């Protein structure tokens, strides 16, 4: 597990600077190696469809730093079973709106990453408004990240600006539920739309190393490793 995952990433890092290089050196990361020889991802966030359907339309989005960005905005009432590390949850969202995120308790790194990744994934208006600094990042291979991966990187590193822009509400009163604050502790207020439940939520190729479905929609790639 430890030696395997590290070995998978090291092959992909050198191959991108690409599919033909990765197969020769061989002969999230390990799933790309298996697909080359013979679940939707957004960084560490793993998603699986529960309900609804999404459709992507390009829009010019004003974001909080004053720039206008061309972003593939998804439309439709949707629900996803989500996971980041050991943290499990259910995400309900619509066009540029996180409507509800029900999660289980986990180590704080995973709870925080799940919440941030879901806020970014939702394309919520408040998340776009929370950008302050520069978001043009070039990745390890010298490639400019797409707008959605720029926001992921930005907010994973600067989470405090997001949460204060996101806002808070009174925590739910149901016995199995509690709220979660900005420090990822149980709280009588909660990040808007987010709740923690004590009830265990159940468990679940392109030349540039991007895995594709039969329809066309890509499920994971190099940016997710
Ligand atoms: O939209 C994209 O360009 C890609 C990028 C790489 C993974 C994700 C997120 C970024 C996305 N791919 C896909 N996204 C979705 C999707 N459905 N509903 C959504 N709401 C927000 C969102 F953000 C993505 C989606 N459905 C099928 C996909 F195949």
DSSP 3-state of 32: helix
Q: What H or E segment, with its residue span, contains residue 87?
A: strand 87-94
- Residue closest to 210 by CA, chosen among 16, 28, 30, 32: 32
- For a mutational test of ligand 1's pocket, the pick from 218, 220, 222, i.e. the residue with the most ligand atoms closer than 8 A to its C-beta, is 218
Give bridge partners of residue 59 from the DSSP assignment: 71
Measured in residues, the chain has a length of 225
Residue 209, phi-psi category: left (phi > 0), alpha (psi -120 to 50), beta (remainder): left
DSSP 3-state of 194: strand
The CA 32 to ligand 1 mean position distance, Å, reads 18
Tokens of 138: 């070039």
CA distance 110 to 115: 8
Residue nearest atom 7 of ligand 1, based on CA coordinates? 42
CA distance 179 to 168: 10
Task: Confirm if 145 and 139 have CB atoms less than 8 A apart.
Answer: yes
Ligand 1 binding pocket, CB closer than 6 Å: 40, 42, 54, 56, 72, 74, 78, 121, 123, 148, 217-218
- For a mutational test of ligand 1's pocket, the pick from 41, 50, 51, 54, i.e. the residue with the most ligand atoms closer than 8 A to its C-beta, is 54
Residue nearest atom 26 of ligand 1, based on CA coordinates? 54
Instruction: List Cβ neighbours of 14 (8 Å cut-off, separation of 6 or more).
Output: 21, 25
Task: Confirm if 128 and 58 have CB atoms less than 8 A apart.
Answer: no
Task: Confirm if 190 and 179 have CB atoms less than 8 A apart.
Answer: yes
Give bridge partners of residue 196 from the DSSP assignment: 103, 178
Instruction: List Cβ neighbours of 172 (8 Å cut-off, separation of 6 or more).
Output: 178, 179, 190, 195
CA distance 34 to 22: 11
The CA 13 to ligand 1 mean position distance, Å, reads 23
Instruction: List Cβ neighbours of 5 (8 Å cut-off, separation of 6 or more).
Output: 29, 30
Task: Confirm if 32 and 211 have CB atoms less than 8 A apart.
Answer: yes
Tokens of 58: 């390009």
Tokens of 14: 């050198």
Task: Confirm if 25 and 14 have CB atoms less than 8 A apart.
Answer: yes
């Amino acid at each position: 597990s430890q030696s395997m995952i590290v070995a998978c990433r090291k092959i992909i890092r050198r191959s991108i600077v690409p599919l033909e290089l990765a197969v020769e050196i061989a002969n999230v990361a390990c799933d790309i190696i298996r697909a080359a020889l013979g679940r939707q991802r957004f960084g560490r966030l793993e998603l699986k469809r529960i309900s609804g359907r999404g459709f992507k339309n390009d829009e010019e989005i004003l974001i909080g730093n004053g720039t206008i960005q061309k972003i593939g905005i998804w439309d439709g009432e949707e629900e996803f079973h989500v996971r980041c590390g050991e943290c499990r949850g259910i995400l309900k969202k619509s066009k540029m709106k996180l409507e509800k995120l029900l999660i289980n308790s986990a180590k704080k790194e995973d709870m925080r990453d799940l919440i941030i990744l879901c806020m970014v994934f939702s394309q919520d208006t408040r998340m776009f408004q929370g950008v302050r600094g520069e978001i043009n990042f070039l990745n390890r291979a010298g490639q400019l990240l797409s707008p959605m991966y720029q926001l992921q990187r930005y907010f994973l590193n600067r989470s405090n600006d997001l949460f204060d822009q996101w806002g808070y509400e009174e925590s739910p009163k149901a016995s199995e539920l509690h709220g979660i604050n900005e420090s990822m502790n149980a709280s009588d207020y909660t990040l808007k739309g987010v709740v923690v439940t004590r009830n265990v939520i159940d468990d679940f190729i392109t030349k540039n190393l991007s895995l594709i479905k039969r329809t066309g929609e890509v499920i994971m790639g190099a940016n997710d490793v």
